[PDB]
Design a binder for this molecule. Sequence first.
Ligand SMILES: *[C@]1(O)C(=O)N(CC(=O)O)c2ccc(CC)cc21
Ligand SMILES: *[C@]1(O)C(=O)N(CC(=O)O)c2ccc(CC)cc21
Lengths: 304, 304
Amino acid sequence: SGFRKMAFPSGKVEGCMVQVTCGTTTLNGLWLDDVVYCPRHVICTSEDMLNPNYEDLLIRKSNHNFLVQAGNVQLRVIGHSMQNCVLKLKVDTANPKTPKYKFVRIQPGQTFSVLACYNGSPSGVYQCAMRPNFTIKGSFLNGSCGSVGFNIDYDCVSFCYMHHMELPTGVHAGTDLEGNFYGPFVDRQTAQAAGTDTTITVNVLAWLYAAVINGDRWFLNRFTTTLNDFNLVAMKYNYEPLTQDHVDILGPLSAQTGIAVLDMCASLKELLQNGMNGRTILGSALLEDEFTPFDVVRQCSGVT
Amino acid sequence: SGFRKMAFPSGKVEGCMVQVTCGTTTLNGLWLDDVVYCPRHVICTSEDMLNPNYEDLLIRKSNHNFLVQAGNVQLRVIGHSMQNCVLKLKVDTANPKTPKYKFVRIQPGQTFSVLACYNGSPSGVYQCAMRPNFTIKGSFLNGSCGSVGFNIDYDCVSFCYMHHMELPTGVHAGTDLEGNFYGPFVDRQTAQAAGTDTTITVNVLAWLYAAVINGDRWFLNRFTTTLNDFNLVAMKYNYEPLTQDHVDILGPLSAQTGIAVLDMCASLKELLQNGMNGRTILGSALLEDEFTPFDVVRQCSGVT
Ligand SMILES: *[C@]1(O)C(=O)N(CC(=O)O)c2ccc(CC)cc21
Ligand SMILES: *[C@]1(O)C(=O)N(CC(=O)O)c2ccc(CC)cc21
């Protein structure tokens, strides 16, 4: 019993974190096999950040200008290339602690763990979600760029995010491990605003199922709804539209609890219209949307 | 910018988790040097749990009745002893991945990370706090016993908790690594009720300082208070009494923000009396009390 915001064990990713320094800029790198992946803005000064031409700035850099340190030992850089917004630094040593891994580009609403690092050293791990506007709400200070987001399936780490930026509003932006930003963001110190940060409806429903499984049932109402009626209310409350794909994904949670997906939708609709009335659900006074249906199944079943 | 519920990187603790089986019961163990620590109720059947006499049950057990597996390899048990509510299993091999470590008994209000495990395998990591009634609100399923709580200071892991029990209300109880339970709980399947779960006042204030540092300032009021006036309101709201020791501990956060501790107390007093009014602080609709002042300093400064 009990339901917590839980991150994946971070050991497999801690064994991959390195420090990358180019001139006077230092950030984090991800060492997998004989390649170190890092934000391409490691080559920039704070002045260059205002309007960088990365291809031009990279002409002035050779292999020996990238200092990669793993623990307290220096790695030899034998090649470098820019792929989208990441630099790939070929090193002469394969990372002995390289886990089984994949690079995945996640969809909005998907959750992942972030191992926040500074100078190639892990400081903490937390769980977050790719917002529908393609930002994440992380906890990142100067030097955190290059910190990665990931999911784990038994022994394989699927890297899905690398941190690159903080928008002027304090929210965060980054890329997949191929260097492609999530959303319309660019690695430039220019005013970039995020779109509407809607609530991830399918995740709120999954978390309502977790609440029922853990005994918080006060919010269960005597109503049902349809996808179209529910979505009219969801639109009004800045909730993402619910599709039949989302209903399908909640099927195992509906089966475990005996609560039809549309009945849970009607309970959510009443919570939106009436509010919490000073009550809590799983120790929260707001509806939590950073647990996917897969997260709820995993946590409630004890997947290791 | 941004403030998250963050756990310590778990790698150092993942390298210590083992599976301990005695007869038909399997739980987790913590392998440090040549000793494996685990809940003494690994020797019990579900029937024994109702009214166990551990000393008597242990007479029927020899070294070879404790099966310890680290990864997919069996460890040889060459000694066993009961210390309070934990068993210490001496093994013939020192754990090669033993980090620098200490065993600490924490005070209520102190936070720590839990690496939830099943069959000696890590499933997730989350941050929690020792409640003032000496329970924790974790996420633990059957077989999670033996999972540990810890804090890290650079390279030294201070183990503070081992999971032993779930109370009939869904809250959790356990011991320090010397086997002494936090609070009045016993390792027996008998109705045990928790006392008042008060709010950790000093932690709420630390989190209000984190909110100010991250730009959420709407709640800052034009008032001040005294410790005695504040405590009269805190008692009414089931908040822990604030002492001058707590004020001292908030000193660095008071200095960083320029907000006197007693002014923050008056802002908290107004939040308690007026409520949030549908507003949020750091994405929360309730006042968060599972960040200590040390956690706020660490996260806001980037300690690795
Ligand atoms: C990136 O290098 C970094 O560490 N940060 C700080 C952060 O808080 O995220 C940051 C902020 C902005 C930019 C512009 C692309 C880069 C970085
Ligand atoms: C302990 O062996 C365990 O794993 N659990 C399950 C839990 O959800 O915490 C448990 C519950 C009760 C007791 C009685 C002491 C032991 C354990």
